[PDB]
DNA sequence: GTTTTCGCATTTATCGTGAAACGCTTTCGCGTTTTTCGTGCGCCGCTTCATCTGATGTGTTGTTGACG
C-alpha cells in the first residue's frame, strides 16, 4: 500500500546524557519524547521533562495534531516489543 | 774575336701581421610534453540503538555540648 505523509507516525523516547538545571532548581538528566513521520522522517513535535511519563507523549501529540492536523486514516506506532 | 764573369732588373715567392672565416661544442630559448600533486566526491563497512550513571579514605574545621 501507499503511505502518505502524516498517515503513519512513530513515537520514541530518549534519555539525555547532559546534566540540566531544571525550572525547580534541581539538576537532572532530561527525557524527551518525539513523534516522527515514518515516510519523510521529519520530526513533527516534542516535549521534554524530568522523567519518563505519559504527559510528554500526550502533549507532543497535541503539538503534532494542532500544527499539522489529523489525517482521515491515522496510524500511530509505539513499539513495546 | 770567343767565352766567362759581374752588375742590374723584373718577376715571383712568402712571411709577418692583423682582421676575418669557419666548425665545434655549449647553452638558452621557446613551444609543446610529461609527471606529480591537490582537491573532490562517492561508496562501503562497521557499529550502536530498540533504556542509561557516580564512589572512597583521611584530615580539618566548625559547631555544639560540657564543664569550670
Amino acid at each position: 500500500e501507499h503511505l502518505d505523509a502524516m498517515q503513519w507516525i512513530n513515537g520514541d523516547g530518549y534519555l539525555h546524557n547532559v546534566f540540566v538545571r531544571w525550572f525547580n532548581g534541581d539538576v537532572i538528566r532530561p527525557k524527551t519524547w518525539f513523534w516522527q513521520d515514518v515516510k519523510t522522517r521529519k520530526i513533527l513535535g516534542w516535549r521534554c521533562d524530568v522523567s519518563e511519563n505519559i504527559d510528554s507523549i500526550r502533549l507532543s501529540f497535541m503539538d503534532v495534531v494542532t500544527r499539522y492536523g489529523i489525517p482521515e486514516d491515522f496510524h500511530i506506532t509505539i513499539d513495546n516489543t
Side-chain angles (χ1 to χ4, degrees), chain A residues 68-79:
Chain A
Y68 303 107
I70 310 162
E72 308 196 359
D73 193 271
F74 203 20
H75 289 247
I76 291 182
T77 292
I78 298 184
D79 187 21

Side-chain angles (χ1 to χ4, degrees), chain A residues 57-73:
Chain A
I57 296 182
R58 174 189 196 140
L59 299 154
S60 55
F61 179 65
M62 187 190 72
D63 291 340
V64 169
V65 307
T66 298
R67 207 192 294 94
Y68 303 107
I70 310 162
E72 308 196 359
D73 193 271

